[PDB]
Symmetry: C6
Subunit: 80 residues, 6 copies
């Protein structure tokens, strides 16, 4: 895959906020900290309300490429 | 051997394609570039902000394995 | 592909109208123009009304084998 | 296919009526005419009615293994 | 740690006639004992019980499941491998 | 596998409680006992009511990776 590697690699190093849409329709958000041939490591640091104050929770989840339908970043970018 | 050309045709000829996903989602745009396992689809979305229409370029990396069918706008013959 | 490549070559060369059922339910109709190891190119003249006249549209769609469940030809076929 | 081939090759030989359940919940009944590495030619000997006349078709649909969840034969069978 | 786990787990599930639940991705639950498996299918035997003319009838049911349609396989009792 | 095996292996070594989301929507909780190229052996210790007292039931599923949506660890995990 001579395009997928650059593209992710780009999105990761430039810390590009992305939406990962899953085949089951679930939308993940956040940044590609890392990836390999079969998985993306995706960190999202969304805000949260814990007992009437604003906490920010950083859950990082490994998402299987084979369950991703599309990867639509927040801003377009190009490869080396 | 059929896939690459059909794609590579649509890419260079930059014909707008409708690519239906397995879940039924219909994505439209132009094939900027494709890979063994992914298609980079380019589209210019239209948004309404403060009355007037504003547009920008959205680029989607689409996994081939979530795609069912690809319907181009106009039929195309291979090279 | 002892059974597949013939059963499509026979379907392709003999221009048999085929139903393609997709895993997701939606049914495609039309003739196999051409296929490779992962895709089928299915061409189909349709029947459309625009401005009170039956107009026919020839639509060609590359359909990923991996979204296909079953392909049912219009008339029984044989191979060598 | 130490197990899959023998088993499939059995049910074609002994012309064993099989139900094939697809991943999407579809159930096909029929006899395994042929199969290869990725596909199964399922012959269905199905009666039906057309406008108050019994009409018996014989349809040979090619099924992609990747759409099959389970194949359930009508009689228990075994192989070497 | 490549393909060491799948066989041993299955292979001791089969060899020790352990009852297993097989959950298909589509949400179907299949119960039975693993008779055998290759790289791509497991052969699941169970005994089905129907009623014919108001008397019990046991039948042996043996179905070939594709692993690519299996989500998870949960034995009825803990097992361990070599 | 330069990210997946490491990420998995430290989830396993540090007995991190993990939630495994399936493509079909099912959430599986537990911890990675072992994992393969294609399966995760996931152990779950849950409390179950037996005869008016509470008893922990240990359950161990072999999960197929290809049915896994996403792997959400209980807490952050940094690899070597």
């Amino acid at each position: 895959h001579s395009l997928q590697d650059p593209y992710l690699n780009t999105l990761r190093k430039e810390r590009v906020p992305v939406s990962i849409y899953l085949v089951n329709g679930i939308k993940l958000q956040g940044q590609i900290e890392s990836f390999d041939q079969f998985v993306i490591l995706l960190k999202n640091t969304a805000e949260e309300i814990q007992n009437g104050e604003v906490v920010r929770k950083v859950v990082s989840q490994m998402v299987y490429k084979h369950a991703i339908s599309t990867v639509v970043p927040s801003r377009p970018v190009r490869l080396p």
